[PDB]
Design a protein around this ligand. Structure first.
Ligand SMILES: Cc1cc2nc3c(=O)[nH]c(=O)nc-3n(C[C@H](O)[C@H](O)[C@H](O)COP(=O)(O)OP(=O)(O)OC[C@H]3O[C@@H](n4cnc5c(N)ncnc54)[C@H](O)[C@@H]3O)c2cc1C
Ligand SMILES: Cc1cc2nc3c(=O)[nH]c(=O)nc-3n(C[C@H](O)[C@H](O)[C@H](O)COP(=O)(O)OP(=O)(O)OC[C@H]3O[C@@H](n4cnc5c(N)ncnc54)[C@H](O)[C@@H]3O)c2cc1C
Ligand SMILES: [S]
Ligand SMILES: [S]
Ligand SMILES: [S]
Ligand SMILES: [S]
Ligand SMILES: [S]
Ligand SMILES: [S]
Lengths: 427, 427
């Protein structure tokens, strides 16, 4: 009886392993493979990067929780995927065989697009992982000891803009709480968006007006249509273009403390599978989450390819966010099960949507947009205290579910919990 | 076995009849009694009031639809409820006996609070019912023939403010479309809210700023903290107070075309039941929608009493809106079924919330607030094109459901459809 392997224990993969096991019962092996032995709640990383949260608030060991559900856990990184032989080679030389593979490997952080931009080779840091956010906090503490120019923003090719705004705002806010704000010579915001609050999705509600007003209020100077060409000698080299791509200026910005959201690519093990991915290394799938090249490979989350519906003067991407990811997981689990029972599963991701909550302290911004191209059925950008409460409640709930286990209908619970809630709403 | 009577076939009453008959089956009699033989989708009345919709777009005969579902229908108004004898005396002198009564009679429009304000006795119209909205549109057509001052707003004691803003906005808009906007000598907005966009619920998101801007953009002059003392000789007499209730001015406004949302009271048949209601005639219920005085009378919708959580310089009320209404109905249906089965029903309404969608043409404003007292868990006010699409989709849906019939899970459908949707979102 079919062996199902889930590659990646992240926002998509962990729930996918619980859902797959639940759906398939004790008669089928379900193996979860991940590079780390812990789960981390990614959207809390910006707060870790400013010292508002600690690693152990947002991360926990996976093994016990999945094993108690009958899932076989391997805390090892996949180095190779041989799609013909249907085996995965792990870092220690072991291999895992699968009948169905679900790829949930998320993003490769493509620092190499911008020489010197890697967190280890310069002052420009990053908050996408808890390891890097801890490193960002450390460098932030160094800034506090020897104040200098701050640069925060998002690279060309980035697709996750929200956390750049969140980070800039919470850094400014923390500086003030520390009485250290006026010691900063300059505080610049650099983005590849064609305008503030474009967010990779051509704006949502009054995102432009509200985000613009936030940066202005914090004394942050913002530049759009920018690409960083390199980071060298504690200086960021920026090229800025007009709407038509022609460059209209170059800047050289000194940097004592920096944080740019990198562009995302597919991870190497996945990108290295012949015909599986596009040039960026994202898995080409159909509406059923099935690989177009391999009938027994499915994929969910950031790892999948989603074609642009629009283009920008500086390359930007559209974000892949939680609700939609869980929705992909659900479809993949359903369609794999069907495929086991010798049928073709027809479940889909559903309508493209983006949902993001940014907490700036006691208030935040949240948006929902769908579908991708306008005119939209929902296009809301909201600022207020309630967003802080929602964000906190959802992190609490999601971490709790990752420990207790999850089932098929999870993704729908994910929808009404991000707001807050069906729990508070009284069922 | 027990005969169940639903009194009133509106937003709460119709669903409640379908749900009650489905829940009880063929063994129990379910009777629906309503003043009118037709259903009308109330939120569309303001559009009828400006001629953007016709009666037959938003209303339809009830009889065939509920009978085909096993429900007895009586197109008659209840004149009296005798709660000791458990019968209802109708306009024609017939009586209906019940074992359980569910009261869904909505609002009495309390025009008598303001002498001269009744739509039949003056130029100040109203748009809460489709009859009155039609009469409003007629008066608006008279305005077009002989331009004069416009006054739109909400009386003291009102609880439904959104439609006053909508109507002001759509009248201004239709005026422009007809190239008649500049023939209007003045266009004034008068409200008992302490500030623009208080909406009876202490503001939601940036309701204040957004609505204020809307009135300003339409050349509409707004006054808050107002009460209308009387309407006489085509003049509205207004008293305005300060935060402490001291009057700081009186105005006399000539009115050629007017529309003020009246305060709501409990209907006379219900209010006249000794010990059933508060002084406003709203039914005193517990958290199970059951009357506090009569264990066999339940209530849902506007007809129930909800204590204020705050007070305002001019009396105002908090709105009772669709989603919360459907929650009340469901709990009532469930708890009645329970009673018939020797159990105490424990289902509740849930968390207080308000949800409103105002369509101004190709764009609109919607808000969600919960719970009633701040700090809120959700506090969103959104403006945009998607609001129009959502409004249209939900009306189309609600009307179709009232024709097809409905079941218990309806109220969670009302939630995801008021937005748009689970249908678009794809299941
Ligand atoms: C800073 C930040 C803030 C965000 N905030 C929000 C938000 O507020 N709301 C929202 O809906 N979304 C948010 N997102 C977007 C999104 O939901 C996350 O990026 C999310 O974690 C993506 O889910 P995923 O399962 O696709 O990838 P991940 O969660 O990154 O998981 C991928 C996993 O696969 C593993 N892996 C990779 N390669 C291998 C290999 N070769 N072998 C074995 N394992 C491997 C990883 O180590 C990892 O555990 C945010 C993203 C970032 C970076
Ligand atoms: C102009 C306007 C716009 C609104 N827009 C929204 C919106 O966009 N979103 C939202 O969630 N809510 C909206 N509402 C608020 C609300 O949801 C409605 O008022 C809704 O119709 C109330 O539900 P109900 O069943 O309690 O009362 P109703 O829908 O008014 O039903 C009451 C019914 O009982 C009947 N009746 C009354 N007396 C008797 C009697 N003595 N005997 C027999 N039958 C009787 C009536 O004729 C009627 O059919 C709006 C309200 C108004 C007035
Ligand atoms: S990162
Ligand atoms: S984002
Ligand atoms: S974010
Ligand atoms: S009305
Ligand atoms: S409202
Ligand atoms: S409304």
């Amino acid at each position: 009886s079919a062996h199902v392997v889930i590659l990646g224990a992240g926002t998509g993969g962990m729930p996918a392993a619980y859902e797959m096991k639940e759906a398939l019962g004790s008669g089928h092996e379900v193996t979860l493979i991940s590079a780390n032995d812990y789960f981390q709640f990614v959207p809390s990383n910006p707060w870790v990067g400013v010292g508002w949260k600690e690693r152990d608030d947002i991360a926990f060991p996976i093994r016990h929780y999945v094993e108690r559900k009958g899932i076989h856990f391997i805390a090892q990184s996949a180095e190779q995927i041989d799609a013909e032989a249907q085996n995965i080679t792990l870092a220690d030389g072991n291999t895992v065989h699968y009948d169905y593979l679900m790829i949930a490997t998320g993003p490769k952080l493509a620092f190499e697009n911008v020489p010197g931009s890697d967190p280890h080779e310069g002052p420009v840091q990053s908050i996408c992982t808890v390891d890097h956010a801890e490193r960002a906090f450390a460098e932030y503490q160094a800034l506090l000891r020897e104040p200098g120019p701050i640069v925060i923003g998002a690279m060309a090719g980035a697709s996750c803009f929200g956390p750049a705004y969140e980070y800039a705002m919470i850094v400014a806010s923390d500086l003030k709480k520390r009485g250290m704000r006026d010691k900063i010579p300059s505080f610049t915001f650099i983005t590849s968006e064609p305008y503030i609050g474009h967010l990779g999705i051509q704006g949502v509600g009054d995102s432009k007006g509200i985000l613009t007003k936030g940066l202005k209020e914090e004394g942050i100077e913002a530049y759009t249509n920018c690409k960083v060409t390199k980071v060298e000698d504690n200086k960021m080299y920026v090229t800025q273009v007009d709407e038509k791509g022609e460059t209209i200026k170059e800047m050289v910005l000194p940097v004592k403390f920096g944080m740019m959201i990198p562009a995302f690519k597919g991870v190497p093990a996945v990108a290295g599978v012949e015909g599986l991915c596009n040039p960026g290394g994202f898995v080409l799938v159909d509406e059923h989450q099935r690989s177009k090249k391999y009938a027994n490979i499915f994929a969910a989350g950031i790892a999948i390819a989603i074609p642009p519906v629009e283009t920008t003067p500086v390359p930007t991407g559209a974000p892949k966010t939680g609700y939609m990811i869980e929705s992909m997981v659900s479809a993949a689990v359903h369609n794999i099960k069907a495929d086991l029972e010798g049928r073709k599963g027809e479940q889909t991701m559903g309508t493209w949507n983006a949902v993001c909550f940014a907490d700036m302290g006691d208030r935040g911004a949240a948006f929902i947009a769908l579908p991708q191209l306008k005119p939209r059925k929902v296009d809301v950008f909201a600022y207020g205290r309630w967003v802080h409460l929602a964000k906190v409640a959802f992190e609490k709930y999601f971490i709790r579910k990752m420990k207790m286990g999850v089932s098929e209908p999870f993704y729908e619970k994910v929808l009404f919990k991000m707001m807050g809630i069906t729990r508070l709403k009284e069922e």
